[PDB]
TrEMBL record, chain A:
Protein role: Deubiquitinates activated NOTCH1, promoting its nuclear import, thereby acting as a positive regulator of Notch signaling. Component of the eukaryotic translation initiation factor 3 (eIF-3) complex, which is required for several steps in the initiation of protein synthesis. The eIF-3 complex associates with the 40S ribosome and facilitates the recruitment of eIF-1, eIF-1A, eIF-2:GTP:methionyl-tRNAi and eIF-5 to form the 43S pre-initiation complex (43S PIC). The eIF-3 complex stimulates mRNA recruitment to the 43S PIC and scanning of the mRNA for AUG recognition.
Native species: Oryctolagus cuniculus (Rabbit)
Name of this chain's protein: Eukaryotic translation initiation factor 3 subunit F
Lineage per the UniProt record: Eukaryota, Metazoa, Chordata, Craniata, Vertebrata
Record's comment on post-translational modification: Phosphorylated. Phosphorylation is enhanced upon serum stimulation.
Subcellular location: Cytoplasm
TrEMBL record, chain C:
Organism taxonomic ancestry: Eukaryota, Metazoa, Chordata, Craniata, Vertebrata
Name of the gene encoding the protein in the UniProt record: EIF3A
Coiled coil: 60-107
Recorded family membership: Belongs to the eIF-3 subunit A family.
General function of this protein: RNA-binding component of the eukaryotic translation initiation factor 3 (eIF-3) complex, which is required for several steps in the initiation of protein synthesis. The eIF-3 complex associates with the 40S ribosome and facilitates the recruitment of eIF-1, eIF-1A, eIF-2:GTP:methionyl-tRNAi and eIF-5 to form the 43S pre-initiation complex (43S PIC). The eIF-3 complex stimulates mRNA recruitment to the 43S PIC and scanning of the mRNA for AUG recognition.
Subcellular location: Cytoplasm
Domain of life: Eukaryota
Subunit structure: Component of the eukaryotic translation initiation factor 3 (eIF-3) complex, which is composed of 13 subunits: EIF3A, EIF3B, EIF3C, EIF3D, EIF3E, EIF3F, EIF3G, EIF3H, EIF3I, EIF3J, EIF3K, EIF3L and EIF3M. The eIF-3 complex appears to include 3 stable modules: module A is composed of EIF3A, EIF3B, EIF3G and EIF3I; module B is composed of EIF3F, EIF3H, and EIF3M; and module C is composed of EIF3C, EIF3D, EIF3E, EIF3L and EIF3K. EIF3C of module C binds EIF3B of module A and EIF3H of module B, thereby linking the three modules. EIF3J is a labile subunit that binds to the eIF-3 complex via EIF3B.
Post-translation changes: Phosphorylated. Phosphorylation is enhanced upon serum stimulation.
TrEMBL record, chain E:
Name of this protein: Eukaryotic translation initiation factor 3 subunit L
UniProt gene name: EIF3L
Listed GO MF terms: translation initiation factor activity
PCI domain boundaries: 151-357
Shown stretch of the complete protein: 224 to 595 of 607
Localization (cell): Cytoplasm
UniProt-listed GO biological process terms: formation of cytoplasmic translation initiation complex; viral translational termination-reinitiation
From TrEMBL, chain G:
Section covered of the full-length record: 110 to 216 of 218
Cytoplasm listed as a keyword: yes
Gene label: EIF3K
GO biological process: formation of cytoplasmic translation initiation complex; regulation of translational initiation
GO terms, molecular function: ribosome binding; RNA binding; translation initiation factor activity
Function field: Component of the eukaryotic translation initiation factor 3 (eIF-3) complex, which is required for several steps in the initiation of protein synthesis. The eIF-3 complex associates with the 40S ribosome and facilitates the recruitment of eIF-1, eIF-1A, eIF-2:GTP:methionyl-tRNAi and eIF-5 to form the 43S pre-initiation complex (43S PIC). The eIF-3 complex stimulates mRNA recruitment to the 43S PIC and scanning of the mRNA for AUG recognition.
Name of the molecule in the record: Eukaryotic translation initiation factor 3 subunit K
Length: 91, 206, 107, 324, 372, 205, 107
């Protein structure tokens, strides 16, 4: 959870820096600094996270979460039955 | 006896590899297989028992052609098959039964990898007649042994991608074991509630 | 996505995987892939870290003062901890004698 | 006062300890649980402070075999000469499969805890549990079992110490929340090795990326937990089965035989009547599952609760990240 | 004589207490405060309210269903017995909701229902599961009467589930434990007949022991037999009204079957054409937009010659159970096939399962309390 | 006793038994009885064979639909020339066609209406109406694509979750009964620890 | 209730002056006819909508035409509702319940 909440912090300090790299051009001139340096970093970044953008992706992504959630659910189902057999023996 | 056990137990062991309740059909075949699997060096088979154990390993891999060469060699012919008054009828029947049940062990073992299969390629791969192949697959589907649908215009078998993952199989085996633990806790609860049962049943039913 | 495609426990070929999405991919990518962009180019980071440097200098500066006291205090802890804590675990193990010879006196 | 029960405080494990643990990280004892070292410390403010460890190696070829204590004696003198003293107040086995307190680890602990009651037993759990939660699992043994000391035998003192009903979901202490005061030097290295030599910092941090993408982490966790836990579940069920049958199902038959006698013969015994109930081994409450096994129900719920969590995080991140 | 020695001594003791109810609740603070202190259970004080809900209703139902003329029972109770207790200021406890839901029960048997609005509005105090399950009992029945089949069927599901986290324990559903089982079973069975090609929520509500028998009932009802119209309606009547006691069955007194003419024949009109709505939907809607092949295939299926196939077809689309359009030039029938949803059970279970863990972990820590 | 007499002395009576099962008016009785009929026909297939028994064997043992359809045409000649079966001809052919079709629809996900029209000796439009009636009567989840001339059967894949729910439904009810019985037993034990002294004080007023 | 509107206006006896004596009753039932027309028709024929409302003339139908904004279409039906506007499905779309489920599974 600390790796999570410094996660979006990176994206926030990214939002700070990409502003400054845009703003360099906005004021007078600049942005060599992101012409094809950070411009190539960011194309790579969006080719990683998220993936490409159809809606077949979105449904497969959902079906994967529905599977992961069903597995995470089944882990709590097993916690419940780890309990119930542990309990009747104690009775 | 061992060939009759091989043809019954290997399709059953392939289909039920995932199940916790392994019902051994032959205790003697399971003993002989465990003796052959305990030899650290397995040579080419010389004994009639080693040939049927080598054929049983090939038949779990779905290769009927190495199964056939271990069961129908010159050594096994002169030792077993030439003792029959009709050697060639029992040979052709046994080849056909190795093809028919190796198609089943192949389907049970490799279903997980196939999205669709044509009956034409199964006819060519197993050297079996298309009506026989269709009748076997139809019977596996009717027995709930194979999670597949049969497309009649294309003669393709389309698998249902409903096969449980190794984690889903461990969860299914755990659900069966939890059901068995509940069934046994209920039995123990009845034996406890039955008391101590000795003092409260002697005043209702003259 | 499964390891059925990948060959599950061993390649036999040159590593050329295409990109696939698995649990904690988009999570930990968004953590670090965005981090790197703010590390490698940046006019905002290095100043902050040069002032983090200054808070790091400050802590060693506070430390060298405390180190000089820990040179007195932990010296007095270290030497005594050889005696006292040994004498304590002595009495832990010597109690088993006191358990034994006392209980013998009962009967 | 967060301090522990009746001889000891909490524990604090100084960072230079845990550095020395991750040096013998998870090898020299991978598939075998090997006690990888003793935790040497001292009593500090509201806690112990493990300030140094030295590792205990063994004959690890592919099985573990205990060796001469010529190692430990010479090495605890080696500590004593430059540093403090032999002050072993615990121990750490990392080791094998996300945090699990085995019956053997409970027994080795029982010998350790009764001898020196200033103790915890650490279980240092790195990336193997998918890292994951409770990387440092402390756990000391209930002083109740150090008062109903040895031994939990199968029929007497299984039942009797089950009826005393000492804890087996027993409390585990927190380990860090504070300045250890050897933060000092390693603080000074942070400014050096960040920005202007962030090679080895970024190397460690980008380990995260490949904790997600590749081969079957949560999958393999849930796989090993599909096998580990069903093993334990089946064991309790067939253990409970046979004992509950000796408890009730056998009483059922023999008391219905006691019917036939008519519960008394006046001229002579009553041999048959006497020789009903003649002991089977469990009369009630087989203890080593009820205590030590149940410490691992707790650990199996923990592994499940661990493997779940990082899943929960992805199920937020995945949906959300693509939602833009 | 022993019959009406018991009956008359209930009412006369309730008419006694009715004055004490009105006297204590409104104004005498110190008498209420004195009653808070002395016992270890305020359960004795509260039970007597809705204890007299169902016992008084029994005794008044007897007097109702014995005297059918020169009505003494129904205006005495309606004016004095009910409204005096409820309309004026509530007692400060759950007693305010108890007297409310006692009144809601009394109001339910009478077929005058429209103030279900303001009874919910005066349920200001928090919905304890005790009061909440008994609210949804009647509120679902109110929706069943409103011809809101899709709403009422959900409301019956939760109250039959037995993971509304009931624990009872000390006699707050006593001697009618399985009435809550069989009435929710029965009234849900009627709603399934009307609509269902939607839920796919009947899995949660009713267990497979009963789903199997009630499943085939609906099919046998709508498709091929009016037999199920009889046996369903037999079981439905004691549960629809809830007449707590039927009077002594004998031919020498009449007196009882005369109220049961109205009571029963009132519910005849309900299930009559609402059932015949079902068979129209029963035939699965095979092709969503029907050309000449399927429209004639369905008009061969509706009724035969000649006279008046189209009329009857277009009468029945109106009701609620079709949405469609006619085209003139094409001659085409285009229609709406709507479906429900697969899994809604798992995510509702994720807390329910954790209650099996919870009260597991808790109850053994109450045993771990005692034998330690 | 009568089944043993048929199997031992008069296996030719299986013709009349098979015809009586196929021509039965109750569709539920017909489906239930057919499973036991098929076992008896298969046991006697070495002693007795005719087009009527072989029709059932082809359809329910061999799943040979083309053999079963050929045997159905041969059955018409047998039924017309049998003294006892002549009155059952129409009822037999109609119900036998329904059985071929119901079995075909359970195995095949996609069925050509044209192949069906040829097998029924009907026009494609009459075959389509006959399929709609069969789907209604059998409660099959099927979609007719009249433009493509195909009947697509719905995948009644019983979800693995639904099989788990059915197997665990008895376990959940047993667990809930066990929990209620434990809770009743605990509440009976806790009520026995209430000390009897508290009932004495109410005697003074 | 069974919505046999054709049979309703046939069934009427016109010698019962009480049914004339209820003010706005003759139009109220017509307004309920057209109310359910809007819920379950996408179009209706000009002759058809007339007959349901008691065999209306061309001029009488102008009121009912104008009432819900309905108007003529080519050859020659009266528009009632758009096809997508009538149906209103609320079917399969859920499994978006992530937020609550993770809020309860938070600890």
């Amino acid at each position: 959870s600390d790796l999570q909440q410094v996660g979006g912090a990176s994206a926030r300090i990214q939002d700070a820096l990409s502003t400054v790299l845009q703003y360099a051009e906005d004021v007078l001139s600049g942005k060599v600094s992101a012409d094809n340096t950070v411009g190539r970093f960011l194309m790579s970044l969006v080719n990683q996270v998220p993936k490409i953008v159809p809606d077949d992706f979105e449904t497969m992504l959902n079906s994967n979460i529905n599977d992961l959630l069903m597995v995470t659910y089944l882990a709590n189902l097993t916690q419940s039955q780890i309990a119930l057999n542990e309990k009747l023996v104690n009775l | 006896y061992l060939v009759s056990a091989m043809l019954l137990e290997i399709p059953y062991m392939a289909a039920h590899e995932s199940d916790a309740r392994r019902r051994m059909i032959s205790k003697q075949f399971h003993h002989q297989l465990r003796v052959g699997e305990r030899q650290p060096l397995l040579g080419p088979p010389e004994s009639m028992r080693e040939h049927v154990v080598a054929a049983s390993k090939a038949m779990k891999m779905g290769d009927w052609k190495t199964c056939h060469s271990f069961i129908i060699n010159e050594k096994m012919n002169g030792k077993v098959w030439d003792l029959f008054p009709e050697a060639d009828k029992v040979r052709t029947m046994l080849v056909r039964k190795i093809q028919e049940e190796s198609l089943r062990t192949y389907l049970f073992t490799y279903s997980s990898v196939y999205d669709s299969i044509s009956m034409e390629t199964l006819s060519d791969m197993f050297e079996l007649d298309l009506p026989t192949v269709h009748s076997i697959i139809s019977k596996m589907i009717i027995n709930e042994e194979l999670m597949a649908s049969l497309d009649q215009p294309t003669q393709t078998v389309v698998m249902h991608r409903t096969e449980p993952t190794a984690q889903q199989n461990l969860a299914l085996q755990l659900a069966e074991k939890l059901g068995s633990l509940v069934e046994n806790n209920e039995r123990v609860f009845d034996h406890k509630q039955g008391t101590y049962g000795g003092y409260f049943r002697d005043q209702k039913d003259g | 996505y499964a390891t059925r495609e990948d060959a599950p426990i061993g390649p036999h070929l040159q590593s050329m995987p295409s990109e696939q999405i698995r649990n904690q991919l988009t999570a930990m990518s968004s953590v670090l892939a965005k981090a790197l962009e703010v590390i490698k180019p940046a006019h905002i980071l290095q100043e902050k870290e040069e002032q983090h440097q200054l808070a790091v200098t400050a802590y060693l500066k506070n430390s060298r003062k405390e180190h000089q006291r820990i040179l007195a205090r932990r010296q007095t802890i270290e030497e005594r901890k050889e005696r006292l804590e040994s004498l304590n675990i002595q009495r832990e193990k010597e109690e088993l004698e006191q358990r034994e010879a006392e209980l013998q006196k009962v009967r | 006062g967060g301090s522990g029960d009746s001889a000891v405080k909490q524990v604090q494990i100084d960072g230079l300890v845990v550095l020395k643990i991750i040096k013998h990280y998870q090898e020299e004892g991978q598939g075998t649980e090997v006690v990888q070292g003793v935790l040497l410390g001292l009593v500090v403010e509201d806690r112990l402070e493990i300030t140094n460890c030295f590792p205990f190696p063994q004959h690890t070829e592919d099985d573990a075999d205990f060796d001469e204590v010529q190692y430990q004696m010479e090495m605890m003198r080696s500590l004593r000469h430059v540093n403090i003293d032999h002050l072993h107040v615990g121990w750490y086995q990392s080791t094998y499969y996300g945090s699990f307190v085995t019956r053997a680890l409970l027994d080795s602990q029982f010998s350790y805890q009764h001898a020196i009651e200033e103790s915890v037993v650490l279980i240092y759990d790195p990336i193997k549990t998918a890292q994951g939660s409770l990387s440092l699992k402390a756990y000391r043994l209930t002083p109740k079992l150090m008062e109903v000391c040895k031994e939990k035998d199968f029929s007497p003192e299984a039942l009797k110490k089950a009826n005393i009903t000492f804890e087996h979901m027993f409390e585990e202490v927190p380990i860090v929340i504070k300045n250890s005061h050897l933060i000092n030097v390693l603080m000074w290295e942070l400014e050096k090795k960040s920005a202007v030599a962030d090679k080895h910092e970024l190397l460690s941090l980008a380990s995260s990326n490949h904790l997600g993408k590749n081969l079957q982490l949560l999958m393999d966790r849930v796989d090993e937990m599909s096998q580990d836990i069903v093993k334990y579940n089946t064991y309790m069920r067939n253990t409970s089965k046979q004992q509950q049958q000796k408890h009730q199902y056998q009483q059922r038959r023999q008391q219905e035989n006691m019917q036939r006698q008519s519960r008394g013969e006046p001229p002579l015994p009553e041999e048959d009547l006497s020789k009903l109930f003649k002991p089977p081994q469990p009369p009630a409450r087989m203890d080593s599952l009820l205590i030590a096994g149940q410490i691992n129900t707790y650990c199996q719920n923990i592994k499940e609760f661990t493997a779940q969590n990082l899943g929960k995080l992805f199920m937020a991140q995945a949906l959300q990240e693509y939602n833009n | 004589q022993w019959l009406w020695d018991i009956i008359d001594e209930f009412i006369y003791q309730f008419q006694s207490f009715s004055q004490y109810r009105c006297k204590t609740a409104k104004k005498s603070e110190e008498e209420i405060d004195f009653l808070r202190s002395n016992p270890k259970i305020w359960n004795v004080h509260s039970v007597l309210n809705v204890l007299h809900s169902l016992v008084d209703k029994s005794n008044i139902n007897r007097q109702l269903e014995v005297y059918t003329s020169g009505g003494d029972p129904e205006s005495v109770a309606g004016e004095y017995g009910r409204h005096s207790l409820y309309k004026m200021l509530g007692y400060f406890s759950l007693v305010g909701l108890l007297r409310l839901h006692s009144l809601l029960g009394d109001y339910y048997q009478a077929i005058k229902v429209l103030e279900n609005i303001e009874l919910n509005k005066k349920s200001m105090y928090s919905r304890v599961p005790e009061c909440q399950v008994t609210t949804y009992y009647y509120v679902g029945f109110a929706y069943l009467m409103m011809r809101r089949y899709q709403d009422a069927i959900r409301v019956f599901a939760n109250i039959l589930l037995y993971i509304q986290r009931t624990k009872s324990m000390f006699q707050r559903t006593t001697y009618k434990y399985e009435m809550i089982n069989k009435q929710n079973e029965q009234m849900h069975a009627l709603l399934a007949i009307a609509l269902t090609m939607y839920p796919m929520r009947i899995d949660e509500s009713i267990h497979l022991q009963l789903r199997e028998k009630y499943g085939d009932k609906m099919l046998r009802m709508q498709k091929g037999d009016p037999q199920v119209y009889e046996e369903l309606f037999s079981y439905s009547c004691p549960k629809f009204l809830s007449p707590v006691v039927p009077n002594y069955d004998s031919v020498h007194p009449n007196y009882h079957k005369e109220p049961f003419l109205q009571q029963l024949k009132v519910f005849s009109d309900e299930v009559q054409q609402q059932a015949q709505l079902s068979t129209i939907r029963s035939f699965l809607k095979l092709y969503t937009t029907m050309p000449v092949a399927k429209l004639a295939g369905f008009l061969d299926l509706t009724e035969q010659e000649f006279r008046i196939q189209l009329l009857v077809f277009k009468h029945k689309m109106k009701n609620l159970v079709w949405t469609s359009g006619i085209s003139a030039l094409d001659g085409e029938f285009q229609s709406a096939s709507e479906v429900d949803f697969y899994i809604d059970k798992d995510m509702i279970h994720i807390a329910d399962t954790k209650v099996a863990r919870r009260y597991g972990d808790f109850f053994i820590r109450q045993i771990h309390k005692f034998e330690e | 006793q009568y089944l043993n007499a048929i199997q031992t002395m008069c296996p030719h009576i299986l013709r009349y038994l098979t015809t009586a099962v196929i021509t039965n008016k109750d569709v539920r009785k017909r489906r239930q009885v057919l499973k036991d009929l098929v076992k008896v026909i298969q046991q006697e297939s070495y002693t007795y064979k005719d087009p009527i028994t072989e029709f059932v064997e082809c359809l329910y043992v061999n799943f040979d639909f083309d053999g079963a359809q050929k045997k159905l045409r041969e059955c018409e000649s047998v039924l017309v020339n049998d003294f006892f079966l002549v009155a059952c001809l129409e009822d037999f052919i109609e119900n036998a066609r329904l059985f071929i079709f119901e079995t075909f629809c359970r195995i095949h996900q996609c069925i050509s209406i044209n192949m069906l029209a040829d097998k029924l000796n009907m026009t494609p439009e009459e075959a389509e109406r006959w399929i709609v009636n069969l789907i209604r009567n059998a409660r099959l989840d099927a979609k007719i694509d009249s433009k493509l001339g195909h009947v697509v059967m719905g995948n009644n894949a019983v979800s693995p979750y639904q099989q788990v729910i059915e197997k665990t439904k008895s376990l959940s009810f047993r667990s809930q009964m066990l929990a209620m019985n434990i809770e009743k037993k605990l509440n009976q034990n806790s009520r026995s620890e209430a000390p009897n002294w508290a009932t004495q004080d109410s005697g003074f007023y | 209730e069974t919505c046999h509107f054709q049979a309703f206006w046939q069934a009427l006896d016109e010698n019962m002056d009480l049914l004339e004596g209820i003010t706005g009753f003759e139009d109220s039932v017509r307004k309920f006819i057209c109310h359910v027309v809007g819920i379950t028709y996408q179009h209706i024929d000009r002759w058809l909508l007339a007959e349901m409302l008691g065999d209306l003339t061309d001029s009488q139908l102008k009121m009912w035409m104008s009432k819900y904004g309905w108007s003529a279409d080519e050859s020659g039906q009266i528009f009632i509702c758009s096809q997508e506007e009538s149906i209103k499905p609320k079917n399969i779309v859920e499994k978006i319940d992530f937020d609550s489920v993770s809020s309860i599974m938070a600890s």
